[PDB]
Design a protein around this ligand. Sequence first.
Ligand SMILES: CCC(C)(c1ccc(O)cc1)c1ccc(O)cc1
Ligand SMILES: CCC(C)(c1ccc(O)cc1)c1ccc(O)cc1
Lengths: 224, 224
Amino acid sequence: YNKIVSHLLVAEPEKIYAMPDPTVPDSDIKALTTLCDLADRELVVIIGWAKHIPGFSTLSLADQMSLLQSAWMEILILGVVYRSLSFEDELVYADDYIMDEDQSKLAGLLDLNNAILQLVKKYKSMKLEKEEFVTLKAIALANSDSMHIEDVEAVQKLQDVLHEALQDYEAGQHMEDPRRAGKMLMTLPLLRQTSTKAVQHFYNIKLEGKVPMHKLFLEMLEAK
Amino acid sequence: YNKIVSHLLVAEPEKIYAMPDPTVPDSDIKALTTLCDLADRELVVIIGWAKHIPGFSTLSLADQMSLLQSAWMEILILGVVYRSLSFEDELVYADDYIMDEDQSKLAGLLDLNNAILQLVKKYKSMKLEKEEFVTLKAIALANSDSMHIEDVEAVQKLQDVLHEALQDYEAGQHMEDPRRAGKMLMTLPLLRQTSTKAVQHFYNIKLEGKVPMHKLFLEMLEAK
Ligand SMILES: CCC(C)(c1ccc(O)cc1)c1ccc(O)cc1
Ligand SMILES: CCC(C)(c1ccc(O)cc1)c1ccc(O)cc1
């Protein structure tokens, strides 16, 4: 099929482990600390992954940073959503960190994780493919609506290249549904809605100062 | 062109007036009271308008209400965005209520109105047409991601009918850009993001109890 899709598939990063501290008693602080630690390490991986998206590394460093600072939460959330598609009412943050409803309650994340579960449910019904997941991640980066872009036409070209990839993929692989590309694009509002609420929630956790957070996660949170 | 588009055009409601009280001194309370009063009357008009969307009135009354309760803020915001396309740095809430940056500051809405202005700016660059505006309003209603839908397949059919209308319209009217329909769909995340923040902001105004609000606006706010 489409070459951009095949390229994004081979550029997909390896999974990483959450490694919750086995000496620490389970608590809301432990869960939130584990999750923000995992996110910090995933952000390093996301920055490296974006260099593989066609045209991304030719943007100015400022525009690269603006896109990543706008899109990082959507990219992280799309990841856990995809990892969770074969599960029922559980979120696979990592192979060693799967959250059920009780754990979400304990961490203070019941409402936020339930919105992520709504995303999972919709993609399950659509039978979201890995090809579509990696293309949507890249589209979410290009379409992230930063207010600080220098070269707007170059970012629009990036959007166009990835959108065309999705169009072409669906036209060749899903002829039974001539609206599947658009259906995939119409899942992005709920992703943006959930990411908006997640950023607000974890910014409040940052302000409360009870959960330690690493440098990169704080930089992305403070920018966003 | 497409019949659904032509139908939505003739079903477009007439504009209504804000009618700020000329005896009341200008204040943040006056501005917010005027705006929520306008929104309350527009919500009545939106409920009547939705009956014209093909298939909408055949949904259960519960599903009709669920869609409207999820989508109402996006529909209102898309309206002011469209009315503002011929203006510069001003938001045309009504012909008699146009907000510039200073008035937004006075009302406590500078950040929220600036996000609405970001939507305006993007649609200006895309040269958003009335045909596209009315189709996107209907798509926003069908795609509003309510958690309480009874007949999910019927709501998906509604999404499909309106999405096909946009597809067909762009294929016939905008052959120069084979990705214009998708570009239009990719403006919906920023609309959802801005509406999410607006709902939070006006719910806080509701809780502070200093701005009087009418019955329907309160019902939509409390549901959403
Ligand atoms: C703030 C990001 C964070 C910790 C996260 C971490 C790793 C990951 O792969 C996806 C998301 C998160 C966001 C929302 C939420 O409900 C729970 C956790
Ligand atoms: C809460 C709805 C409200 C009052 C509104 C009213 C009429 C209308 O056509 C569109 C929106 C609004 C929302 C966000 C905002 O920044 C300013 C005002």
